[PDB]
Every structure is written in structure tokens, then in C-alpha cells.
Amino acid sequence: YHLDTTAPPPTNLSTLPNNTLFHLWRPRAHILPAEGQIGDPCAHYTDPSTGLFHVGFLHDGDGIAGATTANLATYTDTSDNGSFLIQPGGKNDPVAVFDGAVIPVGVNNTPTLLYTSVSFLPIHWSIPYTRGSETQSLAVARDGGRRFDKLDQGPVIADHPFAVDVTAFRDPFVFRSARLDVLLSLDEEVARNETAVQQAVDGWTEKNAPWYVAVSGGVHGVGPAQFLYRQNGGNASEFQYWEYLGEWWQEATNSSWGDEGTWAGRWGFNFETGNVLFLTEEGHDPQTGEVFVTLGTEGSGLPIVPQVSSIHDMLWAAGEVGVGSEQEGAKVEFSPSMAGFLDWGFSAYAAAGKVLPASSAVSKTSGVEVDRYVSFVWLTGDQYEQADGFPTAQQGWTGSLLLPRELKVQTVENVVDNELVREEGVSWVVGESDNQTATLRTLGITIARETKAALLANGSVTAEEDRTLQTAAVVPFAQSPSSKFFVLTAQLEFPASARSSPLQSGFEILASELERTAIYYQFSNESLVVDRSQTSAAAPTNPGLDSFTESGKLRLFDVIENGQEQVETLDLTVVVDNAVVEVYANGRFALSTWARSWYDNSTQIRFFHNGEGEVQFRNVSVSEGLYNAWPER
Numbered sequence: 001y002h003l004d005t006t007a008p009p010p011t012n013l014s015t016l017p018n019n020t021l022f023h024l025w026r027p028r029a030h031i032l033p034a035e036g037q038i039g040d041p042c043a044h045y046t047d048p049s050t051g052l053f054h055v056g057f058l059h060d061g062d063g064i065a066g067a068t069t070a071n072l073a074t075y076t077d078t079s080d081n082g083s084f085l086i087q088p089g090g091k092n093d094p095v096a097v098f099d100g101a102v103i104p105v106g107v108n109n110t111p112t113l114l115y116t117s118v119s120f121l122p123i124h125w126s127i128p129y130t131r132g133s134e135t136q137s138l139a140v141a142r143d144g145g146r147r148f149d150k151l152d153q154g155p156v157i158a159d160h161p162f163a164v165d166v167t168a169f170r171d172p173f174v175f176r177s178a179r180l181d182v183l184l185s186l187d188e189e190v191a192r193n194e195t196a197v198q199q200a201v202d203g204w205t206e207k208n209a210p211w212y213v214a215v216s217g218g219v220h221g222v223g224p225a226q227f228l229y230r231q232n233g234g235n236a237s238e239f240q241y242w243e244y245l246g247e248w249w250q251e252a253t254n255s256s257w258g259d260e261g262t263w264a265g266r267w268g269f270n271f272e273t274g275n276v277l278f279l280t281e282e283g284h285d286p287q288t289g290e291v292f293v294t295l296g297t298e299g300s301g302l303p304i305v306p307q308v309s310s311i312h313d314m315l316w317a318a319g320e321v322g323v324g325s326e327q328e329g330a331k332v333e334f335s336p337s338m339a340g341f342l343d344w345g346f347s348a349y350a351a352a353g354k355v356l357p358a359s360s361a362v363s364k365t366s367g368v369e370v371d372r373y374v375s376f377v378w379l380t381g382d383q384y385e386q387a388d389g390f391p392t393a394q395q396g397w398t399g400s401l402l403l404p405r406e407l408k409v410q411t412v413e414n415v416v417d418n419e420l421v422r423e424e425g426v427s428w429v430v431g432e433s434d435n436q437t438a439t440l441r442t443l444g445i446t447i448a449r450e451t452k453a454a455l456l457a458n459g460s461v462t463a464e465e466d467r468t469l470q471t472a473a474v475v476p477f478a479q480s481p482s483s484k485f486f487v488l489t490a491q492l493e494f495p496a497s498a499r500s501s502p503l504q505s506g507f508e509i510l511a512s513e514l515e516r517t518a519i520y521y522q523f524s525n526e527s528l529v530v531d532r533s534q535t536s537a538a539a540p541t542n543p544g545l546d547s548f549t550e551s552g553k554l555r556l557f558d559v560i561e562n563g564q565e566q567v568e569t570l571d572l573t574v575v576v577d578n579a580v581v582e583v584y585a586n587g588r589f590a591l592s593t594w595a596r597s598w599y600d601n602s603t604q605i606r607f608f609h610n611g612e613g614e615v616q617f618r619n620v621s622v623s624e625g626l627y628n629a630w631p632e633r
Contacts, residue, residue: 258425
């Protein structure tokens, strides 16, 4: 048998020769290794010397591999044979190398990696923690960052907090903060009043501020948490000793944001890959930005099945930092005011981002004058290794990162101040209001501009005529793409009467007679849904190809656009990069998943409406082709 994707798939894909399915579902514009599997992205940094942006990710469970870009569009591997930067087998990491982050100017004034060095396995929140399993070690970049050499000494943080029964102690993330420096330098009482505090913040200078470190995990019998450290005594030149500032953020076991965990999953049993951001309405600022945190939480249904995390939520939260309460606890504490999802995809997790300086070679070329925060989300290829026999040897690779995303403070103006806005435990805060119309503030999520530009650069453009649907129907576009590489954009406008309706409106993509993937909005539970029940003709006999429904919550607010009140427009941008499908909505929503369609002919796109209520499609268009993200492979 020789692969022919115009003919029915074999009953069992797992019987095919290795690498047979290599190109079938592989993306062309996404970050992934030349072959093999990719894990958590990590260790990103803008090299001060060259201005180039370095990207990192775990690879084949045998270390951290890397790549570089000068425009945040195309990438180049640091080296061949896996492009590894650092691998296990040292004295601090005899068993494995986990996530880490980089300080651009560290030891010997060069990029310094602070990563989790592993000495014992297994490690899981649902079983006893082996003392010394995870420590934080140092490594220094060499040969242009094409390699990270471990410093010849033991870990700089050789143990978890004293006598604390941690569930996990890994994934160090480094950052600077004016608010934290101020809170820790001022008296405990002068740091009580925000007035005095804000004054010191104004004169704060980053150039010589100390580095903070957030380590993720939890505490057995108590709950997930983030452990905060900082260069000892706040000395920017101290890289050896890191004073522990306490559990700056913790939540009770498996508790969740809001009374019914509706908008931000659950805090779960353990916190992973914590990122600390300082956002503004334009980008990233450690002096004036609001505190935002992205993280993955590990969850489980009851009863618990030891060593299995059934749920992997990719969350985000915003809030404020204050000096600790009257206790012998953390010196500073993070208090969430709102929380949500960075990506609602089941397989989306372990986001690892970094500040991308306006001084970066990337930003100078594109002309960006402000500092940005770019986040890279992981899309596990095999349901976190819980897949029911996915044909891995046949594919020859596993997983991918999602498109680079710019994170900032997004505002939604002219929102009618009603129940929809006032709900408790939500993903937004009321910026201002007169009880009639308010401005909302939330986490903004968009494809990094350079990447979005590159995606449409040389693509053929085919627009569709505005259309309205009232009766149930599936209407094929006038001209569908003939490949599985395209960007679909569209705006859906709904009448107020649709909120209380069983309405479902959207599109069907990657479709033919034997396959289809449905993407639609639903008011019943205010969610964007990706129905993959009919996505792959090969899925029925290969359970390895997950087909369950994916979905995310997205509320469309009542707003005033032209003196008239209308239900907010649903602005979609679906990027299909072969099987990798990313659904973006209103600059504040993202849902990614795998759509492993089989036939070459399944490229049809159709308008979809279930006859419940009515929808108005406008500015619908398709850009086909995308682009090659790895020109030199």
C-alpha cells in the first residue's frame, strides 16, 4: 500500500510504514522541529547583541531546542541534529531538563538560562513528592545562543521552600517590576497607601532593577501556587542567591474563579508554566503596566486516577499586587480581579512568552515603537500522551506551537451597563461607567502583527458577498480554496432576539462529501464551537484521532454603535494551517485544535445556520496559501 489521499484511508493507520503520514497533517507557517516531538515552549529572549529573537521548546523529552528569527515571520534552527541548546545528563540534571527562562544580560554579561534540572522521577501532583526531584540551575549562552553551557556548580535554588510539601516546583520565569521593587523597598505602612507608592514607581528605572522569579507548583493538601523569588537583597548583580518572597499567589485545591467556574475553568490541583506580565493598552511596560499572569492548571474529575491529569487549562488572570496581610506569609500577594483562557483548546497549554523590545531587530524592521509581550502556546499532538494509539511512528513527528500572539490590555467601548456586564466571576472589569454605557477592560489576544502580515502577504484573496440566513441551511461559497492552507475572516451580526434562541451560526470548513469541520457561535451557552464529529474519515477506525467537540465561552455584549443599541459583532479570523486550526474572535478570544481531515478534496467552505434566529454575514473573505515559516529547511 502506498499513500493516496484521494482514496479511502486504511482501517488501521498504525500498520503503515514509519513516516508515511509525515506531510498529511503538517503545518507550514507554525513553529515546530524538523521532525520528532515538541513539548512546552520556553527560554525565549531577545539577544541584546544582535537584536534577534530566540525561541525555545522542549524536544523529544530530551532537552531544550532552539531557533531564531529577525522578523517574527520566518525562523532558522540553531543547529542540525535536533537543534538542541541543553540536554540532561549533568550533575544537577541527571534525569531530565524541564522549562526555563532567560535573563538577557546575566552571568559574564551574557544570556543566562535559569531552568528546572531534574534528578528524580516520577513527578506528579497526585503522588508523594520525592525530595530533590526539581531544582533550578544556571546555564550560559555561547556560540550566538546556539548552545547553553551549564555552569559547573550545583543549582542556585537547590530545594523547594523549607518544609513545604510541594506538589511541584518547576518552570522558572524571570521578570522585572517597578511595583514589586517599590512595595519591597518602602516601609510596610507607607506601602499601605497607594499614593506614596505610585510616586516611587514613577522614578523607577528598569536598567538596574533586580530580577524576580516565579516557580510553579502547589502544596499537598492546600492547593496550587506560585513561589516567588528575587535576586538576594534586590541586588541586580546577584545571580547566585535568590531570596524567597513566599507564595505570592495560591488558591484552594480544585477551586475556581467565580461561583460556578464558568469563565476561567478551575485553578485545579497544580499550577504550571507561570508567566508574569505587565500590560498596557499598547503593549508591555514593567513600570506602568497592569499585572497579568498566564498559567496552565492541572485538573481532574473524581475519582482521581493517580498520575493522570485529565484536564489541562491554559488560563490567564489580571489583578493587583499588594504587600502581604498581617502574617508571616508572603511579602507581596497577587489578587485576581478577573480571569479567563489564553486558548480554550483542549490540547492548548503551557504558554511561554517574553518581552519583545521595540529595540529588537524584529520591531525595528517592522517599525513597532512600543515594547510588546509575545506568547507562544503549546498544542500537544497526542492529548498529552493519553491518545488511544495515535499513529506516531507513521507521522514521524508530534505537536506544534501555535502562532505567536501579542498580549495587552484590550478595551471594549460603548457597552450597555446591564446584567451581561455585571455578572460575577467574569473575564473582564468595568473600566468606567455612568450606569448607562461603560468601558470594559480585558486581556487582548491577537496574532503577532508581523506573523499575520506574513500569512496574508502572498495569498490569493477571494471575497464572498454579504449574506443573510434565516431558514436552516448550509451554503457553499462561490469559490472554495483548493488547499488546506488559508485564512478565513468574517463578521456575524445577530439580532437581540437571538440571545434567547437555540441559534447556531457559522461555517463548515475542510469539507467534501465524506468530511467536514463545523465552526459556529451558540447563544444557548454563549460559546464558539468546533464540531469535529465529522472532521476525519479516518477517525471512525482510528480512535487515536480525537474527534470530541471543542468550545470556548465568548459573550457578545449589548453596545451602542450608531446611536442604536445592537448585539456586538462577532469578528472572526480562522487560520487553517493544514490540520492546525486556530479560531480568533474579537481580539480577546482564541480556540485551537487539530482537524485531521483525510481527503485532498476536503477544502470546501460553506455558510452554516441552523434556522434558529437569523444571522447577517458581512466582510467574509478567504486568503489562500499562507507561507513557509522555515525557508532554510
